[PDB]
Design a protein around this ligand. Structure first.
Ligand code: 0F5
Length: 271
């Protein structure tokens, strides 16, 4: 308000508009996200009645006890919008931009990044939060430390064990049961999206652009990809939801063994 200086617009879209900023009191880098009230579908409430976007409830749930998920520092209400203050690593690059620039990632680098995304999604789920929009656009890379951060909880929901029948994340990462039936369970839909994301990292682009391709579930590799990495992708993209791996089965897969630590990853790949 006068607590923050605003710097450049970092992006805008379905998610409203997000700006780079600095917290005046201690110069802490922050991101400042403006969410229009008209565009919030889900509202939650705080343990004291205050009515908030669900995104704020979800961020508070996962605020606790990691570093692979973005931290909500503060929020404000305005007549037509909420304003969320989020942490901001610096230097940082969004993973979508990084893959635009480098193309397909070497498997060692994709394995370190993918592993870190699995740790961040397991943390959301352990805190009772389903993200519902895992994709390269929603992952930031801290370039000095090689640490990834999952961001943008504006499509997320409380995690539950029954079926979801609404969805507003990214269609090209959504599963065949959502396309066909408008119904999915949270964890198996999250594993499908992680299959899309892993194919995106190792091939430099997503496998499916059309509904008909998502429902057929046939995966073709246009880049040289090891048979263990293709096996994992094709498992995550199983057509039947119950044939997809759990998070523990993904992290015990042969392709996931010997992961680099984030700092080594930065030393080797991010300079
Ligand atoms: N949904 C797209 C909106 C454009 C954005 N693009 C960028 C580009 N550079 C930095 C950041 C950034 C930095 C620090 C924090 C955050 C956190 C956010 S942004 C958001 O919508 N929800 C968040 O939690 C984002 N975002 C990629 C998320």
């Amino acid at each position: 308000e006068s607590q923050y200086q605003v710097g450049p617009l970092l992006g805008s879209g379905g998610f409203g508009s997000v700006y780079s900023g600095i917290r005046v009191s201690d110069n802490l880098p922050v991101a400042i996200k403006h969410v229009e009230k008209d565009r919030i579908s889900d509202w939650g409430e705080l343990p004291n009645g205050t009515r908030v976007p669900m995104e704020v409830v979800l961020l508070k749930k996962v605020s606790s006890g990691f570093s692979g998920v973005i931290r909500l520092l503060d929020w404000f209400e305005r007549p037509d919008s909420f304003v969320l203050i989020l942490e901001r690593p610096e230097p940082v690059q969004d993973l979508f931009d990084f893959i635009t620039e480098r193309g397909a990632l070497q498997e060692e680098l994709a394995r370190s990044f993918f592993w870190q995304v699995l740790e961040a999604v397991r943390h959301c789920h352990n805190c009772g939060v389903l993200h519902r929009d895992i994709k390269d656009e929603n992952i930031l890379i801290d370039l000095n430390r090689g640490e990834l951060k999952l961001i943008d909880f504006g499509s997320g929901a409380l995690l539950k064990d029954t079926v979801y029948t609404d969805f507003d994340g990214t269609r090209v990462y959504s599963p065949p049961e959502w396309i066909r039936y408008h119904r999915y369970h949270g964890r198996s839909a999250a594993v499908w999206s992680l299959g899309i994301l892993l194919y995106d990292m190792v091939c430099g682009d997503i496998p499916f652009e059309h509904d008909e391709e998502i429902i057929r579930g046939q995966v073709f590799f246009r880049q040289r990809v090891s048979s263990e990495c293709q096996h994992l992708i094709r498992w995550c993209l199983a057509l039947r939801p119950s044939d997809r791996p759990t998070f523990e089965e993904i992290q015990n897969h042969p392709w996931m063994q010997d992961v680099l630590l984030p700092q080594e990853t930065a030393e080797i790949h991010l300079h």
